[PDB]
């Protein structure tokens, strides 16, 4: 019994779509959905998507309000569509997937993920919803998240953090660490051994280890001394070189956060989406040092130290492939006389 | 002698409409009003209303720039239209009322509030403007604000704060506390005895009493001890319970402000408008505790303590009606064995 | 070989237009440019200009990413168009000039600034680009910036600061202080002796002299005592009078910054553009003191003290013309009994 | 080497996309594509589709300019996508199919119809294009059109008419009658015995038989006499009853054309699309007789006479299923005392 | 005293801008200008231009309502701007020129054509307006139209027809044949000897000579016999060959008009603008013969016969340049054994 007025009634009264009966008067003007509240129009939704306004409004209302995997993890695992839910991409203000299964009549390709249209697509299943572990078992392609063990299925322990309504958090009152499962062409796939990005912000960065606490507190030359990092180009890679017109290094989010406390800088997110490695056009406000494409990754400093120290430093240049967030991230390792010159998430 | 170019000349030269003669070249592109300043277009206004762009621009230029009652107070008092002014709703970026009286030819229903079209509408009158106290006396319906006494009219002392250009403040250089008067069907109405919401922000919250100072400084168990609040469920109602998947209580703005200093949280204002009780889809970033509809009221902690302590705690559940901002706010009081379990502004 | 898809490929892969070959799939919906990234549309640009979306996108991609003069300086020097570059106006989110020379086929009036269409326009030339000092010599009208000396040309030392990608900064890793040259009707013009505005922000204001350090630290009556400013109305002009309904003085940005640390205020930028003197509709949140048109200039306090102390204080009212950012700024000097009453950048 | 500017160059110089090299300056304003021609913008395309303006422009430029099957035939045969062409729907001013194969990077699901994504879709193959008869032979699902015979495959002779650039015509200088072949799950189908709609216009109707010539040239009572149609309700079904408030019958396009020659009428095409049976809200201007849903079919009068005369007239009401344009069209047959009362394409 | 409301008052009351005082309430919604007429909005103008809606509305209201030269003639003569008028391009629904002189504050480059900005532009002068013949005399670049003679200046007799409000006509109650004068760099030009296009419509074509009357009234083989046109390929060029998939010839509008009377056809005007030679994607509805780019010129049949008979027919292929509407039109002449094969306005 789906309608624009019922979706709007649910938003107004329940904070989101909750399947409740009722209608509120709605008006659509260009890309905005309004509702009449005591004679005046009140904005309920501004369409920032490439879908029609009323369609995007319904998908946003019907978004998953439980902690769900971050869009970067879902993309890295090849997810095409979700089963009977909408994963809302808060970084793009749009649905994470083009089509739906049993959500909205305009975007639905099927009502149930058992329909043959879904067979070639990697469907996302949520083990916390009844019957979805079985739907994954019957799916030709898919990604499954669970809170516990599935008999017979070998699990992948995912990241500690999940996205609850656009807030990336490591749950205390809710479970955010899931078991991951993937199927390609009817066959369960062994998910690789992987590092996870920490999903932290530059402005509200918090250290998640004693090495990270020591990086933000200690001076450059004494941190490198304490952690035996001499010859690993941390001065360039992690700390950043702001002495020339082109900003040198600065590829770890912790280094950007340390720099940010002393002096601010402009990070231009020219491709605004969730991804394991982010690209920014950075301009340091203090020195005027800048870089058009500065690739930044948020790894735990210990994980980055482990990656760089596990590399052979005897060649001039080579690609170093590291599994991060289930995807293979190519890095460019540049050495000279047995020491690192640079190490950066390779620009493609 | 009203024109788009004259309204724009006034905005450019006077900061708002000031009745000054002159014209500036204007260009309208979609919902934005631009003006040519030395060969380049400069944005003067972006239409966020459901009115035509040039009409919304004129009403915004013709907005009341004196401290006026907050839109929630005007709505609670049943105001439909203002007399010869525009009350700009800064929370909605739109006029507070659909039609005008003697303001804009496109939105005007009348030139003077004495026209019979205005008789059934509650017209807002400003006693600070010449002849408006008399216009209220002649109005069939209306709300009047004054700075002093009106002979014969029994006043209602309003809130200490008013809105000056979207800034809610308690005036020191201007008067913000008004006398309130209301008329329904030619008859002056006795405005009820009322509490007032404090209109504070979460991010720049300031305590307005020694009890409020003690709430933000003292620990939970010693504040409740000092103010004899044992058995009144302040731990749930005011402090908030962040231990379960559903966020418990957290219905007073002071409690949200105390929580905000320690850890941040997302408050989704899904119905963005001015109102006595606000509804937020809250997500606690620390714990992942969340609630789709968390009703929040900004009462002075002393006023809330007075309301909860003036209740009979012998029944399981009952509606407790409290007059706040001239409106009757229904609360849901839940008790057990003579103690409060919960008390919240009842969701309708 | 210019295309929308190639401009988008360059934005996606290089952070801006870099002349690289390649195409990415693009979709245009209303005023937004999107690109397909793994099956979902990602926003690359939102058109805030009065130009067509694809045209504004190309000019933004083709923007000058080197430290360039601030748009206010270029406007004050009468610049109409830039030679083979786009000066992006980050204060207006639009190109600083209507037409281009050798940049975009839609906005180009010429391919080279030597074309007779450019002769009557003041073309901006960048001495850091090969052949542009010669193009200035051949131009009938123009403004030239250089890093060093041009044989025979008498230079004007410009401001210490320039705009690098919208960040106004005094360069340490890049050069931001240029030599300025201007030509009117084939004849090189002597640029006047000038003060420069400091281009600081209210929220991140930093003192650039011991007088500025003393202004923000010392109390009003002891700063005026230390710097012998008795009788110069600094209490009104610089500190601001918040005792009446109309906010008195407050015309220097340092005074606004000092006030801002104690109590916040709303500054309404009703003409949002870069300019030597800015106009704000200010509302003091603490007192409710307000002014529709409060002209603010960011001069170094020492430069403002020098200007006010170099004035004859024997007449009631007179216009005081001061050269700031190469433009003549008219001030209104009001005196009484040999003392300053007020001194403000005269509202036109 | 696809670009918006190259698609526009092709439109401007070749009348459509012809793979020619070159670029013209383009500007996009809302849903319109313009090109600069001697300093002024000239409209090239107005987007009437739900696709982005630049995407719809490219698909329209890349439309099939050879006589192709009418969209109703393709829909009736279950065609989902075309192989390496765009079937433009001139009745909807939009592409006939959502996705493309080897046409536009934004809408392409595959480059070649041999990709596994196309296997479950009924792909349209044109035997006039080299290798497409062989692509149909290897495809799991698909519809093939040919001018001549295919080895082994028995054809289904299609309609005499095809659509050449939106003009439905029976070709004299081009071939418009095709052989149809269909494959479902790898098996060549035996297409059903079918009547074809004649695809004529009301305003330029031409008779295609001596019975049709006699219907237009003769009076009602003598045509029915000559063709022994007494008792078949042609007076109601074909001629129309304009004597009551509800317009009676009028379900054959020839009858509407006969009526149109005498007096005009408004046909409201409330679902504007190509389809075997059309629905119109008709209002007769002469009498004021009207019908909200008047289903109209354009059958050759001889074919309609054959259908109605091949029915059992002994029951009050029954569904009569007829294969028209390869689809099953349900009709409603209403009889009384062995005579037809009405016979109309069933409103479902 | 220019305003949007005054321009709208003039449109509503005078049918166009007539300088009358007064204002009507206006509302702008996207690209449409509305006015309130008795409580309901009535559409006054729909913007089909690339200019802002209110700017295009004012230029349309301020359009020249006297018979003016057709936009193709003005373009061919190199006119850039008009002096104190707006030449409205009814074929593009937009102003014929980008900028104005003394018309609209948004589009004006100057108030009087004597300003130095106008010196390098070819300004259009109308001798019917007081002092414009003298303004042409003093202007460096410009085109002058006059009804009668100018002292000293030898005229160029223009076409018999002019455009009166979008209606191309040969005036009987008004003068439509003008004397043309042109000046380049201060020197009066000798305008070339030229043929004129007749500017006729396909649907309402009228013969303007006994040869044209005979072309329409006679059969192909007897017209060619009467006018000794054997060997000049009129059967192909003028009559059209509809026997093959590609429509042969059909380059004269009289031939299209003759064909149109027998059977209809679709002419797709893919570059909709006024021009001496027009290009159409033609589809013949009777035969299905079609051509993507069919160049059509409307010459008087006698003028076309004179052009083709004044050509040397001894080479296989050559460009034949003919002055039509003051511009040089290249034709492609194809011969074989001394006879014409084809002759068409060269597709460049
Ligand atoms: C609808 C009027 C009409 C069109 S064609 C036609 C006719 C031609 N030959 C016999 N009849 N009558
Ligand atoms: C195209 C049909 C037509 C129009 S005018 C015309 C004619 C008039 N006098 C001779 N012939 N024939």
UniProtKB/Swiss-Prot annotation, chains A, B, C, D, E:
Q: What's the catalysed reaction?
A: uridylyl-uridylyl-ribonucleotide-RNA = a 3'-end uridylyl-2',3'-cyclophospho-uridine-RNA + a 5'-end dephospho-ribonucleoside-RNA
Q: Where does the AV-Nsp11N/CoV-Nsp15M domain start and stop, copy by copy? A: 64-189
Query: Superkingdom, according to UniProt?
Result: Viruses
> What cofactors does the UniProt entry give for this protein?
Mn(2+)
Residue positions of the active site: 236, 251, 291
For the ligand (uracil), the binding residues are 291-295, 342-346
Domain NendoU: residue ranges: 206-345
Site feature (Uracil recognition site) residues:
295
Species per Swiss-Prot/TrEMBL record: Severe acute respiratory syndrome coronavirus 2 (2019-nCoV)
Mind telling me which residues the site (Transition state stabilizer) is annotated on? 291
The protein's name in its UniProt record: Uridylate-specific endoribonuclease nsp15
> What function does the entry list?
Plays a role in viral transcription/replication and prevents the simultaneous activation of host cell dsRNA sensors, such as MDA5/IFIH1, OAS, and PKR. Acts by degrading the 5'-polyuridines generated during replication of the poly(A) region of viral genomic and subgenomic RNAs. Catalyzes a two-step reaction in which a 2'3'-cyclic phosphate (2'3'-cP) is first generated by 2'-O transesterification, which is then hydrolyzed to a 3'-phosphate (3'-P). If not degraded, poly(U) RNA would hybridize with poly(A) RNA tails and activate host dsRNA sensors.
Where in or outside the cell is it found?
Host cytoplasm, Host perinuclear region
Record's cofactor remark: Likely affects Nsp15 binding to RNA.
């Amino acid at each position: 019994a789906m309608s624009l007025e019922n979706v709007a009634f649910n938003v107004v009264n329940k904070g989101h779509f909750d399947g409740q009966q009722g209608e509120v008067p709605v008006s659509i003007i260009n890309n905005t959905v309004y509702t009449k509240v005591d004679g005046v129009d009140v904005e309920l939704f501004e369409n920032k998507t490439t879908l029609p306004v009323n369609v995007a409004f319904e998908l946003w209302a019907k978004r998953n309000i439980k902690p769900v995997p971050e869009v970067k993890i879902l993309n890295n695992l090849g997810v095409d569509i979700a089963a009977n839910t909408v994963i809302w991409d808060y970084k793009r203000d749009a649905p994470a997937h083009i089509s739906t299964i049993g959500v909205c009549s305009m975007t639905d390709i099927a009502k149930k993920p058992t329909e043959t249209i879904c067979a070639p697509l990697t469907v996302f299943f949520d083990g916390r919803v009844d019957g979805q572990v079985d739907l994954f078992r019957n799916a030709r392609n898919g990604v499954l998240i669970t809170e516990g063990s599935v008999k017979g299925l070998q699990p992948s322990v995912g990241p500690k953090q999940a996205s609850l309504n656009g807030v990336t958090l490591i749950g205390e009152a809710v479970k955010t660490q899931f078991n991951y499962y993937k199927k390609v062409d009817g066959v369960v796939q062994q998910l690789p051994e992987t590092y996870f990005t920490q999903s932290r912000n530059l402005q509200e960065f918090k250290p998640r280890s004693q090495m990270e606490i020591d990086f933000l507190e200690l001076a450059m030359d004494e941190f490198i001394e304490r952690y035996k990092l001499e010859g690993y180009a941390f001065e360039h890679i992690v700390y950043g070189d702001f002495s020339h017109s082109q900003l040198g290094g600065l590829h770890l989010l912790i280094g950007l956060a340390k720099r940010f406390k002393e002096s601010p800088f402009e990070l231009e997110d020219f491709i605004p989406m969730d991804s394991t490695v982010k690209n920014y056009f950075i301009t340091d406000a203090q020195t005027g040092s800048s870089k058009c494409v500065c690739s930044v990754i948020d790894l735990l400093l210990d994980d980055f130290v482990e990656i760089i120290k596990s590399q052979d430093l005897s060649v001039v240049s080579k690609v170093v492939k590291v599994t991060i967030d289930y995807t293979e991230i190519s890095f460019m390792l540049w050495c000279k006389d047995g020491h690192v010159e640079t190490f950066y998430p390779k620009l493609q």
